[PDB]
Structure formats: structure tokens, C-alpha cells
């Protein structure tokens, strides 16, 4: 699941 809480995508 990709997540972007702060401007950057990570898994």
C-alpha cells in the first residue's frame, strides 16, 4: 500500500 502523509510516497 502506497502512502503519502508528508509529500513523499513510500510503501
Amino acid at each position: 500500500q502506497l502512502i503519502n502523509t508528508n509529500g513523499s510516497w513510500h510503501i
Partner: antibody
Amino acid sequence: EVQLLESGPGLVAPSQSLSITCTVSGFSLTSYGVHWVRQPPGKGLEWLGAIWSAGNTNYNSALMSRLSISRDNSKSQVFLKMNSLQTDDTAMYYCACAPIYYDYTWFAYWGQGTLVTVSA
Amino acid sequence: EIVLTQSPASLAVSLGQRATISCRASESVDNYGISFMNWFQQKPGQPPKLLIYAASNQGSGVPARFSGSGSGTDFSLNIHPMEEDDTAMYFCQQSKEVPYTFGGGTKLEIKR
């Protein structure tokens, strides 16, 4: 029901500042990024910046020094402030949202937009 | 940053034919095995509507005749068969990294 609504000044004199409020309902700001996009009349979309779910911000490269974005989670409000507007800043100003996931709600909900005319 | 070059600037397509719009990025918009390329439709007097996310996935309320494709730096939106309500502005957008950026837009009209 995800909803966004812009409130802006309509008319701004050149060199004066712009303040727009995006009021949201149907989601919490701590779970979404809220993005600002503008569109000069008859021209293209321009990403101005965002306040991410974590509460940090990022901005358009060329306009960053004139732009400030903030939020008030308790009031479900996101704010755009822009300095010293000139005629080039005449545009429709939108807020839009996207969750922390990349899915079909990506920029799927927008406000109707508020038109800002820069003129004396 | 990642500059998106959208082509054509404008075109008209007759009913039932194919409209092809392209978006080329100055560098890859791929990461984690997917392409962060989005497409929007905008009708007069309306905010944009999401058509396509992740290069090829269709948004809610998006007819099958809208198809996105591509990877890396080269992407396309195909509309076929073209219908009357498809006259609109179309924009690509990359969301791989900040700043997010838009293509310059395509004005697509009906030839009749």
C-alpha cells in the same frame, strides 16, 4: 460526502495580498492533503502547493516565495495567502483533496473555485 | 522539476472516431512499480474531474471509452469512440514527487 468550498476576495488591487479559505466537510484534515490549483482565464492548471495530512507544506517552484499555506483542523479550514498580486495572478483558484493513499479519489473532489481578478 | 509536455494543443474529432492525447515527462514518473500519471477532464465553468490515475486506472464515473496508457516518460489518453459530451479540456498531471505539475492542456472538440 466529501465537499470543499473556497471563499475569496473576488477583486484584489495590484500589489495587495490575497487570502482564500477552503472549508471542507466529510473528511478530516489530519487524514488528507489539501491542494491549491489556479487557472488563468482560458489557460491551463497550475499547482500552487499543498498542506499534507501531517501538516507540512510544499509549493510551486516559481511562486514559492510569495505563497503560504496553513490549516486549522478544529475548523476544517485550509488557507492560501499570496503576496503582492499582479495582473498575471488573475485566475480561478481551487482547492482539491487527496487521501494518504493513491487511489480513485486522487484529486477527485474539488471546490467550485473562486475567481480572483487583479485590478484597481 | 518534472515538466509535462502535452500534445496536441487542440484538435477536433468526429463522432465515433478516436482522440489521442499524449503527455511526455522530462524525467520518469515511475516509482514502486507504478506510474504516477493522472488525467483530468474539464468542462466549461466546472472544476476538473479525475479520469485516470496511476496511468491506466479509471476513476469513478469514467466511461470505458476513456483509456490511459504508458510508462516512464511517455503516456497517452485515448477516447474511442468519441461522443458529443467529450468536448472538453484535458490535462495530464504527475504526482510522483513535489512539486506536482500539470501538462499545458488539450482542447478537444467535435468535428461535425
